[PDB]
RNA sequence: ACUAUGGUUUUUAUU
RNA sequence: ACCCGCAGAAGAAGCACCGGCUAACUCCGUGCCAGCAGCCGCGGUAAUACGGAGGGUGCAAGCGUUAAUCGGAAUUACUGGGCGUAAAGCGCACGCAGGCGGUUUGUUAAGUCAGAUGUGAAAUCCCCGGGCUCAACCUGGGAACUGCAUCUGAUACUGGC
RNA sequence: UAGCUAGUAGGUGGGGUAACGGCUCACCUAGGCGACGAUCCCUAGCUGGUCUGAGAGGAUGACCAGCCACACUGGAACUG
């Protein structure tokens, strides 16, 4: 593994895919203040269980699709 | 200003603005002439002084100050402008050239004589 | 470029004689040198600090013969390292080949001796050496070639060196005339333990 | 003895019925070449008359301040009216740098030299009184010594 | 306010001061005993206690020495609204040495002179002198 | 407080 | 390149600036004109400011006159503002993405901090050595490119559990 | 400047290359981007660096070293 991370779940329009929110938990380079600042994966998914809102562990791969360079590894918290 | 907004969106310089941009930021500019006058400052100031309404290789009519002493400047004689700032003498801030292209220097120059495009002294 | 023209309102200017047409019109002066500068100075006294800072940019830098780039990169090397800039910069001065020729006593002024390195006669390290620009090595050896040494302008500027004292930071061999720069000066050694403030905040805004 | 510097002199203007009536005016300090100071203003007739009114003056709104051998060990500020400085030690650089009541003011407390800038309203005679501010803003001459052992 | 406990300490003892008094009082936390046992170990205080009944009220007794002041700078650095963060070598200096600065640090509340012996970095919270 | 009322004077050396 | 000679001062000095800021002085002419000018301001009968002067100052193969891009400019404000009245507190309460969050233990190491392995080419400021007649130039070395990666580690506090 | 996007976003079957991929053909879906600024306009090639200033942050990427793109203009092919 190369980069492996955890995030929320926004899309699930997809068979074979999801759309994760993940955060850059960065410092402001002129302003000095924290932000959280959300990111926008596209993450391949075959087994199609996790759905919206839903918390899920992905990890970094070659490419699979144009903008997809992502898989799913685990379903972390359930939102109902 | 808060850093919560400049962090969500910065803020912009008001204004700083331009004195002659009709010069398209260049030290001289082209121009064709057409007539030349007589011209009176602020009162204070009272004299009679020269100009000449000259358009600009570009799009623009501007009002050019004549110094030295001399009148034989035409229309269509195309001469140089350079930005010089006037404050008491209405709507110029534009100086002409003496020293190059269809324009004439000034006769006997006791003290500062390389002005105007003035050669030396032989005559 | 460098001053052409009247010598004595050069001599007037600073106060102090040049050694510029200083034969027996020197003997006691009758001559506005210690007196007369231009013409006026009594009745409308301005007394501008800013001409007294405008009057040691010149004075500092005349002595020396250099021009305002010359001493303003002789700066840069003093302004380097801390300030003390005074001290750092009079090493540099002092360095020169036309002032080293001029403390040898090869030359009546450092223009004199400017002009007999300009001429060829010098020679540094066993090599010839026509630039003033130059900076001497501690114990490294100066000297004159054999065709110049009989000049009458030269010849009378080591007979006026001889009537003077010597400077202890070099040594020469009047019967070989050569021999070696020991170092740099020091301002205390070379005058006197003092501040001048003016100096220690030359050039620049 | 207490040493004495001119900071300013000049001549003022009055507009009155009928005519203009000229008058001279000084800025001075005066100190005694070791910690203690005071600065000086009035207005007079002929320059030498106001600088002896405005150097009375220095010789009646005095402070005297403790410094370890006569150094501003750490960057310091002085306020007076909306006028404001701001002074820093050093590098040994070009180091003095500096002009009018931020030079004067230091030179006839014996003080040595700083880096100094104003704010606010610079009108010099409300800076010089921010200057003898930011000189009480100094800490005690000497406290660390005994407050903090090593 | 609850959203900071370090104005809740540092405030009241520049306005303790201003008051002159010789003692101060504050509801406490393990962080403002932590910070008055370290004011004690660096001569800005000479007691911390704490006592109460339902309720922990930590009392400071003030070092004063030989004359008038016990702090001429208690400047905060670090705050909810922006955080300050030093490695050992960007590590303050306060008021030419004449001052401490208050580093946070991985093993407990120290000193600047004690993180750069131990050559270590980490939150600036507050300088004093 | 102690009668309810009455408009205009060219820009100008210029201190 | 370098070396030695053959002729003759011969082949060579400009340009603003001089009331005040701003160093250089104040005679006569003009009489709000003619002109000056960067800024302040000057010009109607001795004008320190124009013209005309003779003298005087400063740079110098340059000197004056400008433009580009910055500085002075906090005049977009992180460093570093303004809102009672000198610009602007929005008429009041309700809800809200975001910003801040008691008092503690345990966990995590994302923020942070520590130590390693890399990468930040060569050139370059800074700093130390050497050679060209000096510097530029040609360069031996050390700094630095505050970072961004790959391990290992502390665990106080913010975040997460 | 508030909308912009039908190969755009996603699926299901077949192909092409030295390899990635809606690279490409067909059958189905309504997604995707956008106030943390899509659409659109003026301006501008990228980095090492250069460089103003107290510094921040910009400005500036002629020279030397390494990338991009152009070869009057547009669009293809042949060959390695």
């Given amino acids: 593994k190369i980069r492996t991370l955890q995030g929320r779940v926004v899309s699930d329009k997809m068979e074979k895919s999801i759309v994760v929110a993940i955060e850059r938990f960065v410092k402001h380079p002129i302003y000095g203040k924290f932000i959280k600042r959300t990111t926008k994966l596209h993450v391949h998914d075959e087994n199609n269980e996790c759905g919206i809102g839903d918390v899920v562990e992905i990890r970094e791969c070659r490419p699979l699709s144009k903008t997809k360079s992502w898989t799913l590894v685990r379903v972390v918290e359930k939102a109902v | 200003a808060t850093v919560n907004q400049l962090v969500r969106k910065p803020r912009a310089r008001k204004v700083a603005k331009s004195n002659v941009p009709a010069l398209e930021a260049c030290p001289q500019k082209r121009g064709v002439c057409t007539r030349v006058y007589t011209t009176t400052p602020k009162k204070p100031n009272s004299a009679l002084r020269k100009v000449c309404r000259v358009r600009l290789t570009n799009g623009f009519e501007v009002t050019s100050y004549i110094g030295g002493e001399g009148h034989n400047l035409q229309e269509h004689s195309v001469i140089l402008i350079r930005g010089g700032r006037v404050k008491d003498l209405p709507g110029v801030r534009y100086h002409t050239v003496r020293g190059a292209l269809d324009c004439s220097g000034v006769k006997d120059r006791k003290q500062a004589r390389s002005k105007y495009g003035v050669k030396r002294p032989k005559a | 470029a460098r001053y052409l023209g009247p010598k004595l309102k050069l001599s007037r200017r600073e106060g102090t004689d040049l050694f510029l047409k200083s034969g027996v019109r020197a003997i006691d002066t009758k001559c506005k040198i210690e007196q007369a500068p231009g013409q006026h100075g009594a009745r409308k006294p301005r007394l501008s600090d800013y001409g007294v800072q405008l009057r040691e940019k010149q004075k500092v830098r005349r002595i020396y013969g250099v021009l305002e780039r010359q001493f303003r ?14 001290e750092n910069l009079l090493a540099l001065l002092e360095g020169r080949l036309d002032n080293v020729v001029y403390r040898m006593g090869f030359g009546a002024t450092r223009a004199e001796a400017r002009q007999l390195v300009s001429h060829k006669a010098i020679m540094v390290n066993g090599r010839v050496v026509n630039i003033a620009s130059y900076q001497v090595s501690p114990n490294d050896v100066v000297s004159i070639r054999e065709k110049a040494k009989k000049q009458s302008r030269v010849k009378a500027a080591l007979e006026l060196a001889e009537q003077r004292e010597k400077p202890t930071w070099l040594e020469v061999d009047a019967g070989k005339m050569e021999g070696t720069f020991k170092r740099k000066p020091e301002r205390s050694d070379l005058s006197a333990d003092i501040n001048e403030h003016l100096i220690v905040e030359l050039y620049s805004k | 003895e207490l040493q004495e510097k001119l900071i300013a002199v000049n001549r003022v203007s009055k507009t009155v019925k009928g005519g203009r009536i000229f008058s001279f005016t000084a800025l001075t300090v005066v100190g005694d070449g070791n910690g203690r100071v005071g600065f000086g203003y009035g207005k007079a007739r002929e320059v030498p008359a106001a600088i002896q009114k405005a150097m009375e003056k220095a010789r009646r709104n005095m402070i005297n301040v403790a410094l370890n051998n006569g150094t501003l060990q750490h960057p310091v500020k002085g306020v007076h009216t909306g006028s404001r400085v701001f002074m820093q030690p050093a590098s040994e650089g070009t180091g003095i740098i500096a002009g009018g009541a931020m030079r004067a003011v230091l030179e006839v407390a014996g003080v040595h030299n700083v880096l100094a800038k104003a704010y606010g309203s610079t009108n010099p005679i409300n800076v010089v009184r921010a200057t003898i501010d930011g000189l009480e803003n100094m800490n005690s001459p000497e406290m660390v010594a005994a407050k903090r052992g090593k | 306010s609850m959203q900071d406990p370090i104005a809740d300490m540092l405030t009241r003892i520049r306005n303790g001061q201003a008051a002159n008094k010789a003692a101060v009082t504050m509801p406490s936390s393990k962080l403002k005993v932590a910070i008055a046992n370290v004011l004690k170990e660096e001569g800005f205080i000479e007691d911390f206690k704490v006592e109460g009944d339902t309720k922990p009220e930590l009392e400071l007794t003030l070092k004063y020495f030989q004359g008038k002041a016990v702090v001429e700078s208690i400047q905060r650095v670090s705050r909810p609204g922006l955080r300050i963060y030093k490695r050992k070598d960007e590590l303050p200096k306060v008021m030419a040495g004449l001052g401490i600065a208050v580093v946070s640090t991985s093993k407990g509340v120290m000193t600047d002179r004690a993180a750069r012996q131990a050559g270590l970095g980490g939150e600036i919270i507050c300088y004093v002198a």
């Fill in chain 3, 73 to 86: 990169n002789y700066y840069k090397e003093a302004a380097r390292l801390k300030g003390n800039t005074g």
